[PDB]
Amino acid sequence: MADTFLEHMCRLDIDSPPITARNTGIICTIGPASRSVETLKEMIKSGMNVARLNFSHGTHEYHAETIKNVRTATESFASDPILYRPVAVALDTKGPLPAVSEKDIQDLKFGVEQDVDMVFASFIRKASDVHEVRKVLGEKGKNIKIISKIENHEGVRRFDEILEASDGIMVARGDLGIEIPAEKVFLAQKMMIGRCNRAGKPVICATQMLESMIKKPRPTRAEGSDVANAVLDGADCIMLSGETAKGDYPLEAVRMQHLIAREAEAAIYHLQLFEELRRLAPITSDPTEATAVGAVEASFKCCSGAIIVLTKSGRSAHQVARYRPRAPIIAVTRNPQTARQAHLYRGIFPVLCKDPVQEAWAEDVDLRVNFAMNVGKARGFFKKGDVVIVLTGWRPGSGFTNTMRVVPVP
Amino acid sequence: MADTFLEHMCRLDIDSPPITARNTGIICTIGPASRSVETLKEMIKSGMNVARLNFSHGTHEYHAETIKNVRTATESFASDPILYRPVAVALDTKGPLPAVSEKDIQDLKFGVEQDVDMVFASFIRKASDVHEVRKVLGEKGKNIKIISKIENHEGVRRFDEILEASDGIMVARGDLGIEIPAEKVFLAQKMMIGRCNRAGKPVICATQMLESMIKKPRPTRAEGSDVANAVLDGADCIMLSGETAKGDYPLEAVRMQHLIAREAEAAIYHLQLFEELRRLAPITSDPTEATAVGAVEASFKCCSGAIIVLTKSGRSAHQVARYRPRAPIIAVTRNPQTARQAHLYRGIFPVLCKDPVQEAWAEDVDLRVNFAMNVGKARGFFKKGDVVIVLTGWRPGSGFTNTMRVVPVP
Amino acid sequence: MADTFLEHMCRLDIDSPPITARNTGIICTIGPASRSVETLKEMIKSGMNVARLNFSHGTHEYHAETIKNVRTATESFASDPILYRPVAVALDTKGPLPAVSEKDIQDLKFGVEQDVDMVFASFIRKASDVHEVRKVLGEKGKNIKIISKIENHEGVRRFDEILEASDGIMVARGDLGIEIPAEKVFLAQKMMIGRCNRAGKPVICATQMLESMIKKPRPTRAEGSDVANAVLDGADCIMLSGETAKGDYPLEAVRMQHLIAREAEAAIYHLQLFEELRRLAPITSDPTEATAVGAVEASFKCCSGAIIVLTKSGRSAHQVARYRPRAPIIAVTRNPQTARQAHLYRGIFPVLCKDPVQEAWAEDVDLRVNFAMNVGKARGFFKKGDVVIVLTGWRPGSGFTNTMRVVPVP
Amino acid sequence: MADTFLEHMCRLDIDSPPITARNTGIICTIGPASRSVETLKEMIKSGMNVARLNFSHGTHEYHAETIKNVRTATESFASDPILYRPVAVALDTKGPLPAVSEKDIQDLKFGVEQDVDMVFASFIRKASDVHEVRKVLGEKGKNIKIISKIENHEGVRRFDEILEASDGIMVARGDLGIEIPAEKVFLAQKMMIGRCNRAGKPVICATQMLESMIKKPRPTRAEGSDVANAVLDGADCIMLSGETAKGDYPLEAVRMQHLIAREAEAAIYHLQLFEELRRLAPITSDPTEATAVGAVEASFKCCSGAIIVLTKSGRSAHQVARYRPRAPIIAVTRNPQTARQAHLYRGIFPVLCKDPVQEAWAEDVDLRVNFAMNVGKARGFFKKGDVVIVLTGWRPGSGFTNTMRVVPVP
């Protein structure tokens, strides 16, 4: 509400409570210390959204035993449709030299077979590397998202063409810190989050985020600040590498990542952010992009508890996320793959609707809107009497999102 | 589209054509040289919205002969519902001393009987003067709008309480220029338009706007600049006093006021304006105020040709007007008094729907939306294939406006 | 002091008194009704800075009789060095076809002989017209300023190259209003003042400013607004054509132009202006441009009564004027031609020092600074105890202005 | 140079080299692993400005042996006046209950005797605690700076009155993280740096900044980001606790703190910063505050290599520092205590002039200005031909700084 950024800082208060919604997603690496169906259930309850499998080490048989476990734990909560949370799987290729080695070709092939939701591609140096990965996945894996790991000086120098070729970006700070002067990594990180924010592409901040929590149940002051600063810069997700894989306190690390992220999302200077994104937004005759910027403006003005968006490809939810609302974006979808991929975008809380398609199309749209009202009350994002923004289209199918209603919570 | 106001000026081009819609309303005084049913038809075609009757001079019988003429000319175009334009009548009291003299009490009483749409109240010095006028009008005239003429130093000094008590304001520069130093009038004018803009109340700029056009068919360079500068400041309507009443060129004066106003509406620096109005807009749980700010933001982003708003009391249209969109605001209403009062607010092009109320309420809402698509094509504000913003409510009656759809022109 | 432009308007007050300094210069046309040595004395006291001679009509002998009169009236006040005001002469060519007709060649030649301070060149259509005028003036008139009158659509279309070729610009609204649609003139005027402000070139706003004051001792409301709006746009000088030449009230017109201009200079939104000029100012290693922007920033922060600048070519004073300070700019110079040309730039109050050059150069700089303190007290711009910004160089000669001192008034 | 903060981020480049000047000061704790006269020399060369002694542990005799060592190492470089760097000593009280325990009274008394430059006061909960410390120091220690360590929830809640009572602030994150939820520490840190920036008071960011560098010669990615983020927030100094006291790599830690800080000072968005500080700066008739804001504006416009400021109490240098210039601020002083205290303020590079006071006061001012030109060339902040801003007063003694000259480097 402050007019300067300096006044905004000065007004920050450690007594003012945060909101119940977390906006930043959480990717955890699954290793030895978290592979168990019991430990996984606890991390899904602690707010893990994305289970990452590292194909540096292990056979295909070890990894397929990890994928079974992740899915078993996930489907354990499937009985209550209101409380179910979809969990994505991510494959992280070893990488290199050629863009795709012989090992990677078999791994990527195994990924399509095991039905992963995304691929983190290692050692991306140019757009033609991303085209090589996309070809190997084929037509069977055409709906798999490719996140390019930036890891060297040439990858940084040619960032713009890689971002145009990708589905999103991973600032992989470990390797980036080996191949450039460690004092410069913070600059590369901010440049890349800036540019991904402007394109509307998801950026993941990774590596040595909670490093001291491998051995001790509490982070250092630096680690608390680091996670919070990635969140304030505009990272879409944050990653836990060794902390979840090999350390002694997997759940504590996930719980610490949850707490920091809510707190830092309450320190964002949204008025300057929403403004700056708009003065950069191209005017077009696209209804969907107009409905979305309308919805974000409305939500500020009435301080809505949520933006509800009905989505098949997730595209309509991605566009709202682009404008960085303060309310959580509840995306309702019948497509299980769409619901898992949604975790990459800041703000989107996906909910998977299981109810069958009613004969009357307007009855079917009402069912899904109420479903999303139930989830929001259950999870405590809003209470009966609050105001929500619902976003829908004028006919069935993708690409027709045109309507925006301001409704009282039933 | 420029980032500074200085760059915005520098980019202005005399070769770039204006839009077909005029946003600033036109009030003309009816005198001897414009009282005729033939001259009136020509001024309605030239874009007169409000016919003002000056109760300084003339009997009640002379004035009732003016009102008959205004209405006859108006109803002559009533055969084509698409082309009909509603025309308001305004009563301008003589005024004073007491707030309401004996003459004014009879005049205001005559106004209620003759069914005027608004009253310009002379010599308003304090809020309790506006309360006196409101009492005299009674309950029979409770829906008549009271516009307070500011005309002296005490009226200026106590502006804020008068604006809170009024339905809108008239900067009456003639008398204001007699009672304060003429070099200060420009300051008082800007202060008052600033403050009325911020409250969302209509302000009228009046007196000696096209003074040289009483005798000559062309204005001076100063007069062209004056009308344009009132428009750029944010006046809702402009007034022609002697030029339409007594001069030789009534139609030329109306036609000159039309041309200047379109041109100056294309020089507004809308990005700074819309921004500044929002940072001053109180957050509330009012759906209507959220739907409206959503609609204005959407309309910028898709450069829509029009905002269509369905309105009974006109209230929903007043709220969109508050945010100063660049598109014309087509307000569709079945209430003839609402359609005439709408001329006071910047941007609102009212259209009066005559078609009977269909049994199905959604069919009835569709009828009025198509009606407003027909008027916009006919008048040339948009063509089939263009994008419009339609604004409607979720149930019948006032105060329920909640929906905003981005639609292709049928 | 307000953060928005809307808040700035709303805060304007007709009871808050203006400052004693006028910032906008005044050019008056000398005709039959103002040619007399007695009437001229009265206009110099009323605040005429520039006497313009129209070479449309009259012989060389009639005009040389005007120049004698202007100079006699001027030199009458020369006895008191503190109160003396320098008065420029301007020649306005008839113009056309070729850039310079045969008549113009003789007139321009007569101008160099009679030692005019500037030339208003009529019907400038392209940069090569300004080069033709510059060649005719020769080397004897190389220090004469050429102000290009814009008067047609091609002159407007090619504005940028003319401004690069000129010493300043005159928006000649009369002819510009004949050759383009009168409703567009206000746009051309603002474009040109925008662009001259950004280049740091003087722009004059001319023609039909106080047109009703030819016959009546009081302006219309439109005329009061027009002069004020040119001042608010950023015109450097304003012009009186027929009002001073042929009308009944020459002194009243000059006195009205004085009053309006002080009042409108107190409504400028200086914080946005100074900001926007800086973000457009190229960084360079030029000391003079750094000393000047330093001085304008200092003057805001201490609300100084004046910027004193010692100047030979006037160049140092032109650079301060570029940043549009709120304090008057007292330019002290020993060069009589520099002191007359200074009237073209907004803010500069020139003072001509007559005292002989002291042997010690620092004693000579102190003499001129005290001289400028005396003039400021005498004219009432500041009183003993107030804070002023003094601007000087490190060695004698042009181009060395480097020092900026904040001093108490002695 | 970018117009948004988002564009500014996007333009950041890891190939663009930083400037030679560091702006953020470095405080190192002296413990067992850095107490030696040989190790100290190496840390002074690596860019240690402030040697902090922790009075938690050790006798008075152990500490007085540390103070001797620090001063011996410092005075070893005193032979070359151009290369000498002044080094401050800081006493950090154990603290508590009463504001000052019995131990603290003896320690503070020992501090005055040993002639320390500042005191870090532990467990400050209210303004009256700072008054207690100030009384104990007496009149013998009246020129010692009191930095209040904030360390609990009541210290945070009553921040404003403590800041008004203090000479500066230390965000002590270790203890602050024990007494409030660790996820909130980042918020408290930013609030406090915001508020100290606005008051113009030095803020120190402390504790677990390079924690992994106790055992390993390289920081984690989080630690690189943490130091950089404190610098970007607007911390004046950064602190190394255990890393310099007990760890294996004292010099590597100091060298890493140097590198990160130059790099992060090249990512500041100075245009928004300088703007926001000015719109918050009170207008006053104080010459010094006007000369200072003038100097910072000039330095941006000519991209000066340095601001040279001649200072006795350091006050004139503190005021320039307040506006956060991009150039280093070379403060020239004959007062050794002033030169050591200057390390607390962001940007000030103090230089201690040893040359005797010349008879002619202007010759004496020229001597010190040239001295500061020599140091800047020697250290590589600028080269002959570059432009510098020199700041001086009109007479001898404190409080008279009024002049600002833009000069070529001799």
Ligand SMILES: O=P(O)(O)OC[C@H]1O[C@](O)(COP(=O)(O)O)[C@@H](O)[C@@H]1O
């Ligand atoms: O984000 P996407 O993939 O464009 O989906 C948006 C679509 O969702 C809907 O609101 C619902 O349509 P379905 O019932 O076919 O899912 C459509 O009106 C709209 O076009």
Ligand SMILES: O=P(O)(O)OC[C@H]1O[C@](O)(COP(=O)(O)O)[C@@H](O)[C@@H]1O
């Ligand atoms: O501007 P008002 O007076 O609130 O009118 C808005 C009303 O118009 C409607 O859209 C149409 O309702 P009606 O059919 O009763 O006119 C309502 O849904 C809405 O509440």
Ligand SMILES: O=P(O)(O)OC[C@H]1O[C@](O)(COP(=O)(O)O)[C@@H](O)[C@@H]1O
């Ligand atoms: O504006 P100009 O023509 O550059 O004049 C500025 C000059 O005026 C001075 O301050 C005074 O010099 P003079 O005594 O020679 O006029 C010089 O130091 C400076 O270079």
Ligand SMILES: O=P(O)(O)OC[C@H]1O[C@](O)(COP(=O)(O)O)[C@@H](O)[C@@H]1O
């Ligand atoms: O920052 P401080 O303590 O006010 O010192 C500024 C003083 O330094 C000077 O420039 C130099 O004076 P000294 O020669 O007495 O040090 C004075 O003109 C000015 O008043």
Ligand SMILES: C[C@@H](O)[C@H](N)C(=O)O
């Ligand atoms: C960001 C947050 O909403 C997360 N993706 C979740 O679904 O819980």
Ligand SMILES: C[C@@H](O)[C@H](N)C(=O)O
């Ligand atoms: C402003 C403009 O729309 C006018 N009120 C009209 O109805 O024509």
Ligand SMILES: C[C@@H](O)[C@H](N)C(=O)O
């Ligand atoms: C602008 C004002 O200062 C004028 N030029 C004068 O000298 O009086």
Ligand SMILES: C[C@@H](O)[C@H](N)C(=O)O
């Ligand atoms: C900040 C930097 O200039 C430091 N104080 C030094 O003197 O080296």
